[PDB]
Amino acid sequence: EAGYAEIAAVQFNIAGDNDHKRQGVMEVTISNLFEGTLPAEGGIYDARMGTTDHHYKCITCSHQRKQCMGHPGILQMHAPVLQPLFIAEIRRWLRVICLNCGAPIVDLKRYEHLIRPKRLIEAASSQTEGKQCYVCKAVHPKIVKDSEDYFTFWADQQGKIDKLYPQIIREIFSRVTYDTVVKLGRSKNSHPEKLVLKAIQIPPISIRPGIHDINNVIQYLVRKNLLIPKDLQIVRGQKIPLNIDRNLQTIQQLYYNFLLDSVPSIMRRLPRKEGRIRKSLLGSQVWSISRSTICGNSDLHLDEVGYPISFARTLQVAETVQHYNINRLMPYFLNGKRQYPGCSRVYKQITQSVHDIEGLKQDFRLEVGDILYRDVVTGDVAFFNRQPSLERSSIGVHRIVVLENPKISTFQMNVSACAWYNADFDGDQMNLWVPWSVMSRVEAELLCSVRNWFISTKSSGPVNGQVQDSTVGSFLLTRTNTPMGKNVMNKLHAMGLFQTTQTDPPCFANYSPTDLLDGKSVVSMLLRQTPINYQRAPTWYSEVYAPYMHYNKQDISTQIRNGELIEGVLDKKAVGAGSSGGIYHLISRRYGPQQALKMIFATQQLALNYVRNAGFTVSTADMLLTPEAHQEVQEIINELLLESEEINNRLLHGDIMPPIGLTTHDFYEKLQLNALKFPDRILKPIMNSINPETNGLFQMVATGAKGSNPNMIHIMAGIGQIEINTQRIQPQFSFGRTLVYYPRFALEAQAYGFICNSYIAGLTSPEFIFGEMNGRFDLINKALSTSSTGYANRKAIFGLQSCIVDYYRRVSIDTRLVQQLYGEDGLDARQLETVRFETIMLSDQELEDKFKYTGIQSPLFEEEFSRLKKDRDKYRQIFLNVENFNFSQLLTDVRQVPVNVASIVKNILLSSTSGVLPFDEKSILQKYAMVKTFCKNLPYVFINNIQERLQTPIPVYLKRAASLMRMLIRIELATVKTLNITCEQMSAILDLIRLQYTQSLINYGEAVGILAAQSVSEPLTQYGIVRPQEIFSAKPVEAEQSSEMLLRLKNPEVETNKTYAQEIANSIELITFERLILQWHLLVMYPDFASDVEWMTDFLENHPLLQPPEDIANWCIRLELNKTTMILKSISLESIINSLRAKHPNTYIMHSVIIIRIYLRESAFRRSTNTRMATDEKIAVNVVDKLLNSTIRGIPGIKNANVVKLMRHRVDAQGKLVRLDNIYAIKTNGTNIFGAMLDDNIDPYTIVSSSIGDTMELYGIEAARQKIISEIRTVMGDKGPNHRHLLMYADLMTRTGQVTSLEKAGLNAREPSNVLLRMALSSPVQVLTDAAVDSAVNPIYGIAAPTLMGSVPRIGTMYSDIIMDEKYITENYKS
């Protein structure tokens, strides 16, 4: 009879007496807890307030303990009590109304121009004590809050001190008219009288089971209530006995502590990580789940997990018995709990009960409609989870393989699947649950399968590939020469490589037992299933190793043509994990991620089955240098130490002069750090000692399977200099010693962390200690890895999680646009391919030769080429500008696009039955129109095919979204490139371009704000220092610690001269007045001033124009100017003097001919009327302080300025885009954009600051949006996320017109009405308190609001509503 409903909004209010008296189901009268077995009627445990005991039902709803939610009760307090949460509210209501009549004392028509939730506080802010009423002429007394408690107020009538008891407060508030409340900020539901309570609510027993410690505070409160007289009356200023005063303050204290004690409190349950919201509402404890240690199993597919049989008989899968599965479920039912696979329970629907299978009837049958809870079998899907769950590949769905060996207790999975979970097999544990519901089982298989996470959402590239044994084993397999000669195997061993891949075996019928097969021939047999085209150089070929090692020419160029490996080895570059553009990324792009996972497993077995016949090992002799090569390393190290000693001997003679800016200490250490670096020739003795064809340590490093060149050098040759914070070992053992082993001010390089020994030789005690110091730093920073990004992750998610994709591919927060199109292109990050645009860099002549078609003389081929130029120029113009407002972000001709149109064309040129087609103008003319019309209708990919047929107008923002793909199609489908393609083959290409473009669009209802928060918080692990905390907190300019600027020079011709750049770089820097002064004194005068009176003499005769003027009272601020700095930066005395009396016309300087003596005037002191302690001592220092800060030369805020060399592009006179390297500019230390525009030596249109606040203040919100993207991008580093996850932070933080933060302040500004989201973030009690006094309506949207209300977000599978097709069922089904 109760229909299905969903909560649409939640309204918050203040509960009064009537609400408690109408919601309450009973009144607490007695203090008896239990009369007998049952709870006492009328006590705090009464059965009307719900049942927490399993013997008796609830009296109210007649439900058991499980279905009863509890019901509230009423306690009629004998004395009115203040509401503990809104005490402040009470205070700020006692200040704005008259205590005798209720009419307001302040003017109602003064605060009305402000927003409602503020004017009440503003009115309470102004002082009101001493003011008098107008209708009753009663002077409003002072309201003073007590400091001995949290609730009692005192009325102070000019010294008359009275205690405002809550009865008096209710009487005062009862006379406040509703218009006073409405027209001064609050709502009709926030009338102040509701702030004093005579009937409190005893919470339902379901909130306080354990018949807890809250039950004591409720019991104590009821007992001391009974002591108070039933009809106690309180009047203003009336005398009361002190025992009553104790009882009144005792019940109020008990009630205040019942709610807000130490925020056993009702409100203490909410706040922290273990509180109600984060632990119980935002998390969960769940059933039907398992956990175990994970272990490797190379015989499992990448989307399979090995499940122990003991676990398979614990966890179950619910099967509703129907006519189509009665025969399949019977064997499970008959096996029961004794044979595998069996079952555990049956749910009979005709009795509505669950029967265990062993203690089950003998006349039992499986009816249609029963639910059989059977075991977990091979082929069932399962959610696999490794914590911390930091990305959306951290939970993936695997097909279950049941391990029927009873001695195995581990979760087994393939080693190439560990990239999803960032797991290894050193003792990691992972969670696993098997979906038992049908709906949860469908979406596990269709949505959450691990093939969906093969391409990273963070980085758009592949996640999985070969690791460590199939990387070094694929190298050995495809290696051209073995130490035994050619790398071949007979037919039997070629067949044996495939006997494990679980694919269909190839045909070896055209092979005799003695026929030899190359390693590439066997790999080609497997790659023919998914023919791809690949050509890169392998990791094996390194120019580092080339001088000292012979490479086989048919190994150093991997090439694959239609699945045939023509040449080259397969290693980390091609088959590795995370290798963009490798074998499996290309297979995924043509055949799907599931087909790529199947090929990773299949090539893994060829690699592993090769090594089980070739062997692979590492020994101690792989790490050992020849005695001849040991002397070569010692020679190289002595050269390092000899060059280090040469610097020290220059220090002995004082011959080390630092540059302008560095001290002698920091220049000496920079010289030492660089003089103690290992030369690239250190690998000559390493590569002379080893055989690359057999050395297993080298082959793990060289193929990219494991290790690096510094690891090989450290083991074999030497460790070298220890750098900590890119610095040597700093003396921390008592003032000039690094360790107790080295003397104070030791000059040897060993004293500061230079290790001359390799690991294989054995370190000494000082070298071991320095290496221990270096190692401990890395552990500590890795310990900050978890904590620092974890806190920033949660604040990023709560600021971003409400961003969800609309039906327009927009990003909104429930209605409010954050992005007009998701990512500005509307695409999924998992569906992008990096493609080269090959017209960007061409010149006007190259472009005309390559792309202009001269075969047919028609105006259509002039127009076809003109659009190629226009797209070329437009691309140049946009991304040349992007280069201007960035520091070091250069133009590129390679973009990420949904569709690789070049590969689509060539893969159709090869599978064609036609060769070079004959010339045919009609075919060429027909093809051009079909490409032209396809590009014109391309933006309809973003709408649908109905509007494309009708050719309705396209929105401008959808025209712009298809601009890159329109440009790419016109390049790769140009007439000069599709000559051989038939018109029938062109329609096939266009259809496949449009299909792949539709498949790459972002889904409706995708939580893309969570995707951005996950994707950007991951590169912060390898970084959470101050700079991220300044971007995300929207800190102002003055709060910055690393502010910079990049000033271009005034002229493209003058940018070349470095000397000219140095001239300007010195001008702009802040040389203030302090640093010019070496000595200064603030003051028959003082001694040593005979020069000053002599300065008085000669200065006056120089020019009689000016003298000590009529206003000079009593002060002598004499200074002297350092002359070295004046020569250092070419300051002039004329400049200093003219500067001082052009900003401060309160002085006469008497510059003399270096000394300076500033005098002042009496007129400078008397316009301090806003200051009434203005003496002579302070104001003289104050004007010195205002004079010392006077800018002598430069731009304020520019502390330093260096000249840097910039890499920039430019279009030549021939139309070619060249990258100019010989460009100089200025990189200041500190930002002042407006200061740089008031300057003719700096180009004002390309001033780049690293400050978001300075850019916003000067340029606007759209320039601050671009600045946020750039400033996040630098912090991300080199493996930062996709660009659309950065547009998500920037578009959210600037959606309101101002830059808001990802903190609670920003969430309050962006989503003020979402109370439940804001409570979940930081501090529920303060958020809830504000919401109650504001009558806040909270619509349910996003994630956190529905989660706290017990519902599920309308997101993903629940974004669109399903309705039943009546018109199809009435004409196809029967009752």
Partner 1 sequence: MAMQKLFTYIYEFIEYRKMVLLEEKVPYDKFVQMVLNTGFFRINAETLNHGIVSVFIFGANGKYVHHGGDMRTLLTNTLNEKKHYEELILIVDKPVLSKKNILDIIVEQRAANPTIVINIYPYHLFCINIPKVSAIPKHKLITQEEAQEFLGREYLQPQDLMQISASDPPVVWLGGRPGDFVQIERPSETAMHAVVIRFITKSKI
Partner 2 sequence: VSTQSLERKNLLNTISALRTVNTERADMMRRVHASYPGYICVAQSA
Partner 3 sequence: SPSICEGFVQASSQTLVIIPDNERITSNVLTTFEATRLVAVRAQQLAINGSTMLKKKYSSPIDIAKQELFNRKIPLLVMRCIKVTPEGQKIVEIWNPREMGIPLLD
Considering only 956, 1084, 1153, 1362, the residue that binds partner 1 (CB under 8 A) is 956
* Residue 1193 interacting entry, from partner 2, partner 1, Mg ion, none, C-beta within 5 to 8 Å by type: none
Render 1264-1330 in DSSP notation, one character per residue.
HHHHHHHHHHHHH-SS---THHHHHHHHHHTTTSS---SSHHHHHHH-SS-HHHHHHHT-HHHHHHH
Q: Which of residues 816-835 bind partner 1 (CB under 8 A)?
A: 816-818, 820-821, 823-825, 827
Pick the closest to residue 165 from 80, 98, 251, 100 (CA basis): 80
Site for partner 1 contains 1262 (CB under 8 A)? yes
Residue nearest Zn ion by beta-carbon distance: 58
Q: Which of residues 656-685 bind Zn ion (CB under 5 A)?
A: none
Residues of span 447-486 touching partner 3 by CB under 8 A: 447, 449, 451
Residue 221 structure tokens: 């409160």
Candidate ranges 15-23, 685-693, 984-992, 1243-1251; the one touching partner 3 (CB under 8 A): 15-23
From partner 2, partner 1, Zn ion, none, interface partner of 1259 (C-beta below 5 to 8 A by class): partner 1
Q: Of 737-776, which residues contact partner 2 (CB under 8 A)?
A: 737-741, 765, 768-769, 772-773, 776
Residue 777 touches which of partner 2, Zn ion, Mg ion, none (Cβ within 5-8 Å per kind): partner 2
Q: Name the residue nearer to Zn ion (CB basis): 68 or 565.
A: 68
Omega into 341 within 30° of 0, i.e. cis? yes
Site for partner 3, residues 1335 to 1374, rule: CB under 8 A: 1356-1365, 1368-1369, 1372-1373
H-helix or E-strand spanning residue 88: helix 87-93
Q: Which among Mg ion, Zn ion, partner 1, none contacts residue 60 (Cβ within 5 to 8 A by kind)?
A: Zn ion
* Residue numbers 916-975 binding partner 3 by CB under 8 A: 943-947, 950
Nearer to partner 1, 896 or 1021 (CB): 896
Q: For partner 1, which stretch binds (CB under 8 A), given 738-746, 754-762, 1027-1035, 1288-1296?
A: 1288-1296
Residue 511 makes contact with partner 1 by CB under 8 A: no
Shortest separation between residue 427's beta carbon and Mg ion, angstroms? 6
Residues 712-731 within binding reach of partner 2 (CB under 8 A): 731
Q: Which does 955 bind (CB under 5 to 8 A by kind): partner 1, partner 2, Mg ion, none?
A: partner 1
- Under rule CB under 8 A, residue 613 binds partner 1: no
When CB distances are held under 5 to 8 angstroms depending on the partner's kind, the choice from partner 1, partner 2, partner 3, none that residue 999 binds is partner 3
End-to-end CA distance of the chain: 24
- Per-residue burial over 659-683, b if 16 or more Cβ lie within 10 Å, else e, is eeeeeeeeebbebbbebbebeeebb
Closest by CA to 22, choosing from 79, 63, 89, 73, is 73
Interface pick for partner 3 out of 57, 441, 561, 590 (rule CB under 8 A): 441
Smallest Cα–Cα separation from 624: which of 524, 809, 761, 774?
761
The minimum distance between CB 24 and Zn ion, in angstroms, equals 13
Number of residues that bind Mg ion (CB under 5 A): 3
CA angle, 968 then 971 then 974, to 5°? 135
Q: Is residue 854 at the binding interface for partner 1, with CB under 8 A as the rule?
A: no
* Contact between 1135 and partner 3 per CB under 8 A: no
238/467 Cα distance (integer angstroms):
86
Closest distance of CB 862 from partner 1, Å: 25
Q: Which amino acid appears at position 26 of this protein?
A: M
Q: Which residues of 100-132 are buried (b: 16+ CB within 10 A; e: fewer)?
A: bbbbbbbeeeebeeeeebebbeebbeeebeeee
The one of partner 3, partner 2, Zn ion, none whose footprint includes residue 732, by CB under 5 to 8 A per kind, is partner 2
Task: Residue 568: count other Cβ atoms within 10 Å of its Cβ.
Answer: 27
Q: Cβ 142 to partner 1, closest distance in Å?
A: 27
3-state secondary structure (DSSP) of residue 982: coil
Q: Looking at the DSSP assignment, which residues form a beta bridge with residue 401?
A: 306
Judged by beta carbon, residue 4 or residue 735, the one nearer partner 2 is: 735
Q: Determine, following the binding rule CB under 8 A, whether residue 219 of this chain makes contact with partner 3.
A: no
Could you tell me the smallest distance in angstroms from the CB atom of residue 1237 to partner 1?
A: 5
In angstroms, rounded to a whole number, what is the distance separating the alpha carbons of residues 717 and 1107? 78
DSSP string, 1161-1219: -GGGTTT-TT-SS--SHHHHHHHHHHHHT-EEES-TT---EEEEEEEEEEE-TTS-EEE
Question: Among 275, 1317, 1323, which residue's Cα sits nearest to residue 801?
Answer: 1317
And the tokens for 306?
Answer: 């090995």
Q: Does 323 participate in binding partner 3 (rule CB under 8 A)? A: yes
Q: Is the peptide bond before 388 cis (omega within 30 degrees of 0)?
A: yes
Find the binder of partner 1 among 294, 682, 729, 961 (CB under 8 A): 961
CA distance 1356 to 804: 9
Verify binding: residue 363, partner 3, rule CB under 8 A. no
Reading the block at residue 504, the tokens are 């269909």
Cross-sheet strand order for the sheet of 1044-1047:
1201-1211, 1217-1229, 1044-1047, 1248-1249
Q: Breaks in the chain follow which residues, C to N over 2.5 Å?
A: 211, 263, 1023, 1083, 1153
The answer to whether 808 contacts partner 1 (rule: CB under 8 A) is yes
Does 807 sit near partner 3 (CB under 8 A)?
A: yes
* From candidates 68, 222, 1131, 1160, binder to Zn ion by CB under 5 A: 68
Please say which residue, 1174 or 1358, places its beta carbon nearer to partner 3: 1358
Q: Which of 8, 657, 956, 1142 binds partner 3 (CB under 8 A)?
A: 8
Contact 78/152 with Cβ under 8 angstroms? no
| Binders of partner 3 in range 585-604 (CB under 8 A) | 592-594
Q: Which of 179, 404, 424, 748 binds Mg ion (CB under 5 A)?
A: 424
Q: Which of 1282, 1247, 1281 is nearest to 1267 (CA)?
A: 1247
Q: Which of 625, 967, 1206, 1268 contacts partner 1 by CB under 8 A?
A: 967
Q: Does the CA dihedral 410-416-421-426 come out positive or negative?
A: positive
112 binds partner 1 (CB under 8 A): no
**Which of partner 3, Mg ion, partner 2, none binds 943 (CB below 5-8 Å, type-dependent)?**
partner 3
- Comparing CA positions, the residue from 709, 751, 756 lying closest to residue 732 is 751
**Hey, what's the torsion of the CAs at 738, 742, 747, 753, to 10 degrees?**
-50
Site string for partner 2, 490-519 (x = CB under 8 A): ------------------------------
Count Cβ atoms within 10 A of the Cβ of residue 235 and give its class: 0-12 exposed, 13-18 middle, 19 or more buried.
exposed
Burial bucket for residue 534 (CB in 10 Å: 0-12, 13-18, 19+): buried
Q: One symbol per residue from 46 to 65: x for binding Zn ion (CB under 5 A), - otherwise; what is it?
A: ----x-------x-xx----
What tokens appear for 11 in the block?
Answer: 């309204």
- Angle at 251 (CA atoms; ends 246, 256), nearest 5 degrees: 120
Q: Kindly state the smallest distance separating residue 1286's Cβ from partner 1, in Å.
A: 9
Does residue 665 belong to the site contacting partner 3 (CB under 8 A)? no
Q: How far is the CB of 776 from partner 2 (least distance, A)?
A: 4
C-beta of 878 vs 1100, nearer to partner 1: 878
Residues forming the site for Zn ion (CB under 5 A)? 50, 58, 60-61, 68
List residues binding partner 2 (CB under 8 A): 731-733, 737-741, 765, 768-769, 772-773, 776-777, 779-780, 783-784
Contacts to partner 1 by CB under 8 A: 808, 812, 815-818, 820-821, 823-825, 827, 874-875, 878-879, 881-882, 884-885, 895-896, 955-957, 960-961, 963-964, 967, 1233-1234, 1237-1240, 1244-1246, 1248, 1255, 1257-1263, 1265-1267, 1269, 1283-1284, 1287, 1291, 1294-1298
